[PDB]
Amino acid sequence: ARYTGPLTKKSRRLGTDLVGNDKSFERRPYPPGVHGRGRTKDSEYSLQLREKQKARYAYGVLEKQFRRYYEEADRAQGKTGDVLLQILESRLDNVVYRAGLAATRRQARQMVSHGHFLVNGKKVNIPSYRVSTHDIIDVREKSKDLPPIVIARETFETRDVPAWLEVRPNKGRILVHQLPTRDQIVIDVNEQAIVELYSK
């Protein structure tokens, strides 16, 4: 119920950097496997499916839960892709990643599932915990000196925190100013393509 295999293979297949940089993605222009350099047809399904899989492997969400997110966004009022990206960003592991306390979303999932975090006073070990507005995520007092935590404390200045979060790095406290908007989620997929895909 969690993808544990290599991520560079998925990034190469999907054609975009799922996470990180300056890595084995120097072989980017071609998917993994023996048949990587051949010319591709890329149907509309192919395109749509690529966008959906890009979002899925970026956020570490499997198909059933991603589908559930899709119906929630579709029911919600407003743009379906905007709401879907808003939900995926409101996931707690992504919140930790965006605040910059984790090197990657996989590391954020690791620490969240291991329970190194407090949500507004209550301990949460659910990576899919949907953080609500005005929430206060806190690092567990016992685990305020994790090696990944201190690496993040050394590196966060380079990292860019989105406008909808406030982070007290050394304190391990992520204040949620508001639930993010499409202009605030970084554009790296085609949510419109995903929405069109979930209609066929």
């Binding site: 005005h134 929430d135 206060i136 305020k144 000196d145 201190v150 007290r168 790095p169």
Partner: protein, 128 residues
């Protein structure tokens, strides 16, 4: 006989009762003549909401309460208004009150010791 009793609802190991009016012969979780209130005992200082006018009407028309409903009416004070007896009538204590916006504004500004205990944990990694 017409009874004022509790109709069980909710999950396994999580009961919420509806103080309802139905005759004795009816099954426990069935059609009720009228729904009077609710009773959540699983919650802190159990929630006890009883419609005073309706419960007074049904007591005056002759509905027989079950012992549980008698306890709830004692706590709501209805069991004293009807069948006047010297009982404490301990109207439910509230199950306290949290808040979110005030805490967020308190911490947004908290700043100071936020990043301050934060550089103290910097000294901690030093200690780490």
């Amino acid at each position: 006989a017409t009874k004022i009793r509790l109709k069980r609802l909710g999950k396994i190991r999580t009961p919420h009762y509806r103080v309802v009016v139905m005759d004795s012969r009816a099954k426990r979780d069935g059609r009720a003549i009228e729904e009077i209130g609710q009773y959540h005992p699983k919650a802190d200082p159990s929630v006890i909401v009883i419609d005073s006018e309706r419960v007074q009407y049904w007591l005056g028309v002759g509905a027989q309460p079950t012992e549980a409903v008698v306890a709830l009416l004692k706590r709501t004070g209805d069991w004293q208004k009807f069948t006047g007896d010297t009982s404490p009538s301990g109207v439910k204590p509230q199950p306290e009150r949290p808040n979110k916006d005030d805490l967020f504004n308190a911490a947004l500004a908290e700043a100071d010791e936020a990043p301050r205990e934060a550089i103290t944990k910097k000294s901690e990694g030093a200690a780490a």
